[PDB]
Amino acid sequence: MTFVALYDYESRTETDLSFKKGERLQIVNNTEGDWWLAHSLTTGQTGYIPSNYVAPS
């Protein structure tokens, strides 16, 4: 629902949200789902993925 920020965060890409400690934040619903940092055993590449695009083995 609604959350509050414990730390400052400075954006690192064009898709992340910068915010300051104190800010109130509201979680938005997306078809993508939560994003996870993942490593591909298939390609060896690594980076964030949309969780709703995958399922357990």
Backbone as XML, in Angstrom:
<?xml version="1.0"?>
<chain id="A" units="angstrom">
  <residue number="1" name="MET">
    <atom name="N" x="0.832" y="-1.198" z="0.000"/>
    <atom name="CA" x="0.000" y="0.000" z="0.000"/>
    <atom name="C" x="0.875" y="1.260" z="0.000"/>
  </residue>
  <residue number="2" name="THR">
    <atom name="N" x="0.844" y="2.010" z="1.102"/>
    <atom name="CA" x="1.684" y="3.182" z="1.309"/>
    <atom name="C" x="2.903" y="2.846" z="2.166"/>
  </residue>
  <residue number="3" name="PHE">
    <atom name="N" x="4.066" y="3.352" z="1.756"/>
    <atom name="CA" x="5.325" y="3.116" z="2.457"/>
    <atom name="C" x="6.056" y="4.413" z="2.730"/>
  </residue>
  <residue number="4" name="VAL">
    <atom name="N" x="7.058" y="4.340" z="3.600"/>
    <atom name="CA" x="7.906" y="5.484" z="3.893"/>
    <atom name="C" x="9.371" y="5.088" z="3.722"/>
  </residue>
  <residue number="5" name="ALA">
    <atom name="N" x="10.184" y="6.049" z="3.303"/>
    <atom name="CA" x="11.572" y="5.792" z="2.953"/>
    <atom name="C" x="12.507" y="5.997" z="4.139"/>
  </residue>
  <residue number="6" name="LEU">
    <atom name="N" x="13.377" y="5.021" z="4.363"/>
    <atom name="CA" x="14.287" y="5.029" z="5.500"/>
    <atom name="C" x="15.591" y="5.702" z="5.120"/>
  </residue>
  <residue number="7" name="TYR">
    <atom name="N" x="15.916" y="5.660" z="3.832"/>
    <atom name="CA" x="17.168" y="6.215" z="3.340"/>
    <atom name="C" x="16.947" y="7.024" z="2.072"/>
  </residue>
  <residue number="8" name="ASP">
    <atom name="N" x="17.860" y="7.949" z="1.811"/>
    <atom name="CA" x="17.915" y="8.608" z="0.526"/>
    <atom name="C" x="18.277" y="7.562" z="-0.518"/>
  </residue>
  <residue number="9" name="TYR">
    <atom name="N" x="17.761" y="7.722" z="-1.732"/>
    <atom name="CA" x="18.210" y="6.911" z="-2.856"/>
    <atom name="C" x="18.346" y="7.792" z="-4.088"/>
  </residue>
  <residue number="10" name="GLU">
    <atom name="N" x="19.510" y="7.735" z="-4.728"/>
    <atom name="CA" x="19.778" y="8.494" z="-5.943"/>
    <atom name="C" x="19.649" y="7.580" z="-7.168"/>
  </residue>
  <residue number="11" name="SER">
    <atom name="N" x="18.842" y="7.996" z="-8.140"/>
    <atom name="CA" x="18.612" y="7.214" z="-9.355"/>
    <atom name="C" x="19.897" y="6.910" z="-10.118"/>
  </residue>
  <residue number="12" name="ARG">
    <atom name="N" x="19.922" y="5.759" z="-10.778"/>
    <atom name="CA" x="21.115" y="5.283" z="-11.473"/>
    <atom name="C" x="20.808" y="5.016" z="-12.921"/>
  </residue>
  <residue number="13" name="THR">
    <atom name="N" x="19.521" y="4.930" z="-13.230"/>
    <atom name="CA" x="19.086" y="4.825" z="-14.604"/>
    <atom name="C" x="17.922" y="5.774" z="-14.832"/>
  </residue>
  <residue number="14" name="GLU">
    <atom name="N" x="17.282" y="5.624" z="-15.979"/>
    <atom name="CA" x="16.205" y="6.515" z="-16.369"/>
    <atom name="C" x="14.859" y="5.953" z="-15.896"/>
  </residue>
  <residue number="15" name="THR">
    <atom name="N" x="14.892" y="4.772" z="-15.290"/>
    <atom name="CA" x="13.660" y="4.103" z="-14.876"/>
    <atom name="C" x="13.492" y="4.051" z="-13.363"/>
  </residue>
  <residue number="16" name="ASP">
    <atom name="N" x="14.573" y="4.307" z="-12.634"/>
    <atom name="CA" x="14.428" y="4.253" z="-11.188"/>
    <atom name="C" x="13.951" y="5.596" z="-10.621"/>
  </residue>
  <residue number="17" name="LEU">
    <atom name="N" x="13.407" y="5.519" z="-9.415"/>
    <atom name="CA" x="12.866" y="6.696" z="-8.743"/>
    <atom name="C" x="13.827" y="7.159" z="-7.644"/>
  </residue>
  <residue number="18" name="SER">
    <atom name="N" x="14.307" y="8.397" z="-7.740"/>
    <atom name="CA" x="15.078" y="9.008" z="-6.659"/>
    <atom name="C" x="14.132" y="9.445" z="-5.545"/>
  </residue>
  <residue number="19" name="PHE">
    <atom name="N" x="14.577" y="9.335" z="-4.303"/>
    <atom name="CA" x="13.768" y="9.809" z="-3.198"/>
    <atom name="C" x="14.625" y="10.082" z="-1.986"/>
  </residue>
  <residue number="20" name="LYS">
    <atom name="N" x="14.050" y="10.794" z="-1.049"/>
    <atom name="CA" x="14.749" y="11.191" z="0.148"/>
    <atom name="C" x="14.144" y="10.512" z="1.341"/>
  </residue>
  <residue number="21" name="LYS">
    <atom name="N" x="14.956" y="10.336" z="2.364"/>
    <atom name="CA" x="14.466" y="9.788" z="3.601"/>
    <atom name="C" x="13.316" y="10.664" z="4.079"/>
  </residue>
  <residue number="22" name="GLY">
    <atom name="N" x="12.175" y="10.052" z="4.378"/>
    <atom name="CA" x="10.999" y="10.783" z="4.819"/>
    <atom name="C" x="9.847" y="10.695" z="3.834"/>
  </residue>
  <residue number="23" name="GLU">
    <atom name="N" x="10.173" y="10.519" z="2.555"/>
    <atom name="CA" x="9.158" y="10.528" z="1.502"/>
    <atom name="C" x="8.143" y="9.398" z="1.647"/>
  </residue>
  <residue number="24" name="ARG">
    <atom name="N" x="6.878" y="9.702" z="1.372"/>
    <atom name="CA" x="5.827" y="8.694" z="1.358"/>
    <atom name="C" x="5.684" y="8.180" z="-0.064"/>
  </residue>
  <residue number="25" name="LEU">
    <atom name="N" x="5.580" y="6.864" z="-0.196"/>
    <atom name="CA" x="5.588" y="6.205" z="-1.489"/>
    <atom name="C" x="4.456" y="5.219" z="-1.572"/>
  </residue>
  <residue number="26" name="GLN">
    <atom name="N" x="3.888" y="5.127" z="-2.760"/>
    <atom name="CA" x="2.754" y="4.273" z="-3.009"/>
    <atom name="C" x="3.102" y="3.268" z="-4.088"/>
  </residue>
  <residue number="27" name="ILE">
    <atom name="N" x="2.866" y="1.993" z="-3.818"/>
    <atom name="CA" x="3.223" y="0.959" z="-4.777"/>
    <atom name="C" x="2.209" y="0.874" z="-5.900"/>
  </residue>
  <residue number="28" name="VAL">
    <atom name="N" x="2.738" y="0.894" z="-7.116"/>
    <atom name="CA" x="1.945" y="0.860" z="-8.325"/>
    <atom name="C" x="1.873" y="-0.563" z="-8.834"/>
  </residue>
  <residue number="29" name="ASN">
    <atom name="N" x="0.703" y="-0.940" z="-9.338"/>
    <atom name="CA" x="0.506" y="-2.263" z="-9.913"/>
    <atom name="C" x="0.896" y="-2.302" z="-11.387"/>
  </residue>
  <residue number="30" name="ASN">
    <atom name="N" x="1.683" y="-3.311" z="-11.736"/>
    <atom name="CA" x="2.100" y="-3.529" z="-13.107"/>
    <atom name="C" x="1.995" y="-5.005" z="-13.459"/>
  </residue>
  <residue number="31" name="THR">
    <atom name="N" x="1.741" y="-5.274" z="-14.732"/>
    <atom name="CA" x="1.655" y="-6.629" z="-15.233"/>
    <atom name="C" x="3.009" y="-7.322" z="-15.085"/>
  </residue>
  <residue number="32" name="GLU">
    <atom name="N" x="4.065" y="-6.518" z="-15.034"/>
    <atom name="CA" x="5.433" y="-7.021" z="-14.982"/>
    <atom name="C" x="5.706" y="-7.799" z="-13.705"/>
  </residue>
  <residue number="33" name="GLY">
    <atom name="N" x="5.163" y="-7.304" z="-12.598"/>
    <atom name="CA" x="5.432" y="-7.873" z="-11.290"/>
    <atom name="C" x="6.682" y="-7.257" z="-10.674"/>
  </residue>
  <residue number="34" name="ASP">
    <atom name="N" x="7.052" y="-7.707" z="-9.478"/>
    <atom name="CA" x="8.278" y="-7.248" z="-8.823"/>
    <atom name="C" x="9.466" y="-7.630" z="-9.683"/>
  </residue>
  <residue number="35" name="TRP">
    <atom name="N" x="10.541" y="-6.851" z="-9.608"/>
    <atom name="CA" x="11.736" y="-7.154" z="-10.369"/>
    <atom name="C" x="12.802" y="-7.764" z="-9.481"/>
  </residue>
  <residue number="36" name="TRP">
    <atom name="N" x="13.464" y="-8.782" z="-10.021"/>
    <atom name="CA" x="14.476" y="-9.546" z="-9.309"/>
    <atom name="C" x="15.787" y="-9.452" z="-10.051"/>
  </residue>
  <residue number="37" name="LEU">
    <atom name="N" x="16.883" y="-9.465" z="-9.312"/>
    <atom name="CA" x="18.195" y="-9.602" z="-9.931"/>
    <atom name="C" x="18.432" y="-11.084" z="-10.210"/>
  </residue>
  <residue number="38" name="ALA">
    <atom name="N" x="18.785" y="-11.419" z="-11.449"/>
    <atom name="CA" x="18.868" y="-12.811" z="-11.869"/>
    <atom name="C" x="20.073" y="-13.081" z="-12.760"/>
  </residue>
  <residue number="39" name="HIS">
    <atom name="N" x="20.528" y="-14.325" z="-12.728"/>
    <atom name="CA" x="21.678" y="-14.767" z="-13.498"/>
    <atom name="C" x="21.213" y="-15.874" z="-14.429"/>
  </residue>
  <residue number="40" name="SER">
    <atom name="N" x="21.479" y="-15.730" z="-15.721"/>
    <atom name="CA" x="21.088" y="-16.754" z="-16.677"/>
    <atom name="C" x="22.132" y="-17.846" z="-16.785"/>
  </residue>
  <residue number="41" name="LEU">
    <atom name="N" x="21.733" y="-19.051" z="-16.406"/>
    <atom name="CA" x="22.573" y="-20.233" z="-16.557"/>
    <atom name="C" x="22.749" y="-20.566" z="-18.029"/>
  </residue>
  <residue number="42" name="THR">
    <atom name="N" x="21.889" y="-19.994" z="-18.858"/>
    <atom name="CA" x="21.901" y="-20.286" z="-20.279"/>
    <atom name="C" x="22.897" y="-19.404" z="-21.032"/>
  </residue>
  <residue number="43" name="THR">
    <atom name="N" x="22.991" y="-18.128" z="-20.657"/>
    <atom name="CA" x="23.828" y="-17.173" z="-21.391"/>
    <atom name="C" x="24.977" y="-16.633" z="-20.547"/>
  </residue>
  <residue number="44" name="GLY">
    <atom name="N" x="24.859" y="-16.757" z="-19.231"/>
    <atom name="CA" x="25.858" y="-16.214" z="-18.328"/>
    <atom name="C" x="25.656" y="-14.736" z="-18.022"/>
  </residue>
  <residue number="45" name="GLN">
    <atom name="N" x="24.668" y="-14.116" z="-18.661"/>
    <atom name="CA" x="24.390" y="-12.698" z="-18.437"/>
    <atom name="C" x="23.649" y="-12.503" z="-17.111"/>
  </residue>
  <residue number="46" name="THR">
    <atom name="N" x="23.641" y="-11.279" z="-16.593"/>
    <atom name="CA" x="23.075" y="-11.017" z="-15.281"/>
    <atom name="C" x="22.422" y="-9.644" z="-15.287"/>
  </residue>
  <residue number="47" name="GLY">
    <atom name="N" x="21.292" y="-9.522" z="-14.607"/>
    <atom name="CA" x="20.578" y="-8.257" z="-14.558"/>
    <atom name="C" x="19.168" y="-8.466" z="-14.050"/>
  </residue>
  <residue number="48" name="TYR">
    <atom name="N" x="18.409" y="-7.386" z="-13.935"/>
    <atom name="CA" x="17.077" y="-7.472" z="-13.362"/>
    <atom name="C" x="16.057" y="-8.035" z="-14.350"/>
  </residue>
  <residue number="49" name="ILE">
    <atom name="N" x="15.105" y="-8.804" z="-13.828"/>
    <atom name="CA" x="14.061" y="-9.410" z="-14.648"/>
    <atom name="C" x="12.682" y="-9.164" z="-14.034"/>
  </residue>
  <residue number="50" name="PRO">
    <atom name="N" x="11.637" y="-9.142" z="-14.873"/>
    <atom name="CA" x="10.273" y="-9.019" z="-14.346"/>
    <atom name="C" x="9.746" y="-10.377" z="-13.891"/>
  </residue>
  <residue number="51" name="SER">
    <atom name="N" x="9.384" y="-10.488" z="-12.618"/>
    <atom name="CA" x="9.112" y="-11.785" z="-11.993"/>
    <atom name="C" x="7.940" y="-12.552" z="-12.623"/>
  </residue>
  <residue number="52" name="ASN">
    <atom name="N" x="6.966" y="-11.836" z="-13.179"/>
    <atom name="CA" x="5.808" y="-12.493" z="-13.789"/>
    <atom name="C" x="6.129" y="-13.132" z="-15.143"/>
  </residue>
  <residue number="53" name="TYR">
    <atom name="N" x="7.376" y="-12.996" z="-15.591"/>
    <atom name="CA" x="7.795" y="-13.571" z="-16.869"/>
    <atom name="C" x="8.404" y="-14.954" z="-16.688"/>
  </residue>
  <residue number="54" name="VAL">
    <atom name="N" x="8.537" y="-15.384" z="-15.438"/>
    <atom name="CA" x="9.181" y="-16.653" z="-15.129"/>
    <atom name="C" x="8.399" y="-17.448" z="-14.092"/>
  </residue>
  <residue number="55" name="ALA">
    <atom name="N" x="8.714" y="-18.736" z="-14.000"/>
    <atom name="CA" x="8.102" y="-19.618" z="-13.020"/>
    <atom name="C" x="9.168" y="-20.551" z="-12.472"/>
  </residue>
  <residue number="56" name="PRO">
    <atom name="N" x="8.955" y="-21.086" z="-11.260"/>
    <atom name="CA" x="9.925" y="-22.065" z="-10.765"/>
    <atom name="C" x="10.047" y="-23.277" z="-11.683"/>
  </residue>
  <residue number="57" name="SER">
    <atom name="N" x="11.175" y="-23.965" z="-11.556"/>
    <atom name="CA" x="11.570" y="-25.027" z="-12.463"/>
    <atom name="C" x="10.638" y="-26.229" z="-12.345"/>
  </residue>
</chain>
